[PDB]
Amino acid sequence: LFEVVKMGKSAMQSVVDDWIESYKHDRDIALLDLINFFIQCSGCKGVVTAEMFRHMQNSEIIRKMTEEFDEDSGDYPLTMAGPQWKKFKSSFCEFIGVLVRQCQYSIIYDEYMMDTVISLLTGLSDSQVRAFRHTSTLAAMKLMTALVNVALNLSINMDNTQRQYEANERLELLLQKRKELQENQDEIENMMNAIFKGVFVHRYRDAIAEIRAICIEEIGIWMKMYSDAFLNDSYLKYVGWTMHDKQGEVRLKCLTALQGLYYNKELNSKLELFTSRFKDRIVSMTLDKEYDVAVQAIKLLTLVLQSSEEVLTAEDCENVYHLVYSAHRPVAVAAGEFLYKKLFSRKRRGRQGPNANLVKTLVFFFLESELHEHAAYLVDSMWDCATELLKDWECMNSLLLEEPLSGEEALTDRQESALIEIMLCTIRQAAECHPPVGRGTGKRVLTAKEKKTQLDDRTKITELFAVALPQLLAKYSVDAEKVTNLLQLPQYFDLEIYTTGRLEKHLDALLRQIRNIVEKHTDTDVLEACSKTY
Amino acid sequence: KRKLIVDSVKELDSKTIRAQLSDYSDIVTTLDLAPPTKKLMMWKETGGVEKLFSLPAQPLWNNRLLKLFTRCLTP
């Protein structure tokens, strides 16, 4: 009985085999036993008399079994932690699903079987006993989750028979099968109303948080399971309401459920209206107190933006833009993806090639938003999504050294300095594969792929700036910040490639230029940079 | 003493529901920014007291002189 759930042995296949074996005898007692086992499955120790309430109302059994509580601790079968929780929670759904699937469009589509269970489930949902109020919603709601697929199969046959009827006792057989295909459907529909009206409408906003979490998760499952019947504000509103819940698990659950529909979206038209009626809140959740919710709130804005490229305004997206300079890397990464697929999506080598306007836009961004003066944080928040824009230094060097092409506006002094900062920070996060202070553990055993990436990036950095740097430190050799930001690259150069590449005249040029800086500058940081580089 | 945790409140008031619907200014927060300049990034690197008690006051860059100082740090 319930000991199968207690030991975790409750399942679907063998349990349905046993249920069918019981049905082989009859369904007269396959309901008495079904109620008896499920009642004790809560965790109490009640009793089932042959006429416990047979002549009376079954609902009366509530207090009668409540008296026989066998109370030991405040924990129902699901609440009792450990394996007795995990295995039971995984197992419970299996029995219900097995019963529904074995129904095979019969018995429940017939009479007195589906109706029998409805009464018990409804009564438990109301009982202020912790047991029933908790595990009924675990199972009674789940039962709607169970039958919606059964009704979902009804449409398929109808459509299949619809073509068969599209076009005698064969035609009269079509007529008969069609009436019955409607009579079952309608009754299954009322059996649905049963749960939603009684088990869902009220338990949806239950006092304790876990039951509400079950309600929202099952409603999201319904949305993914039917893209019509269960895709109307009549059903698409409860989530919008509990979007302002004061707990965190519930809010995460609603956000996840909503993200389900936008995920692999079918471009549902009514969903677009829902997006607008709630954009303000879904955007204000980008700064939620719980940093475990802002991640899943920002990963929904990008999902909306993938299809509906109009609901978001300019200040709405700028609010997200400021979030990329955050402190929590998990939310900063998501802000980076939103920025990437909002603004950064869109002659193989040169200032005129690709990733040129794309790399010209980021300096504009950094010089517009003025929350930070250094670029390390912006560079890191995209190092897992924009791995080709912030790595092709061949164009960052080009944009600062190659002469402006006629028909193209040259960069301002300030824009160039910002680009030098971006270049240096990209060089740093390529060479030392550790994120900036504040974000990241600070200790990490680099994997083989990460070591390979480190070696390749450092080799390219050397092979590129070893020949590029003297010219940079000769043109931008009057400006403090520029020199103090370009004299750090030597520290990130594999100096072994110097010897086995015949690149030594450039070493002489680098040393000569450093001497030129030393004999001409008097700043307390420029000379520090020169000493450290030497 | 049956510890059923049975409480009368198993629902929510519509007044409280609308209050939550309107007053969403208590669940949101401000933005935690990271160092806005390099100097503050450095001072977050070395400002921790563990580093404050294991490094020279006058910055010495060469590992030779750093050892000259830190070898005087006993247990």
Added chain:
Amino acid sequence: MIFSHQIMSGGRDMLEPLVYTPDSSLQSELLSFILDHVFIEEASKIEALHKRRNLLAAFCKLIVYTVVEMNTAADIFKQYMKYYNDYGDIIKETMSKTRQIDKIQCAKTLILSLQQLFNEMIQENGYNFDRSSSTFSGIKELARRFALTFGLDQLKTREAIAMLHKDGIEFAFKEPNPQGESHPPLNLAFLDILSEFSSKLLRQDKRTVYVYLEKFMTFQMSLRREDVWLPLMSYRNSLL
């Protein structure tokens, strides 16, 4: 820090010549500089905060690694609460390290700081100070934490807290009152502060400190129940 007696820590003693012990003149000048340019009451805010934190870290380094006399740590422990945000986590670490070196002398420094605050009040506020409001409450609040710092490891923590009470008693009964010996001894309200440290002793040490309290009390003063004696009554009830 570099040329000290620590230069021969399991290291070559050939370098014994260059061991420099700072003189008391320099040990006073460093403390004067610290108390004049570190403890003092935009971008220039954090600038100066971190600069002063580095300077205080250097002096606390010299205190913890035993280069200057520990007794100079009283003038730093005197400002734990007034700067719990500016410089508080430095001073807590200095206390945690200065406990390990010498608990006895650490207790001496703690109760010397507590006896220089009391003297700070006597220096201007007035001997008939409120005794129920303002900076006395701050002193009691400091004393509570400073008592919490001395956790009951029982690793000779008994002697530290006993020698701490001894110092408190000897400071309380230090200067007889000029008015007359028929009136309470001066600096007796301190015993009210000393009460926060009572719980640290166990029963036997409480009795021993009581018998040492009898060395200055006298029966007639024990039976003397007046408002001016409230602190002595409180201390006695603390030790009982």
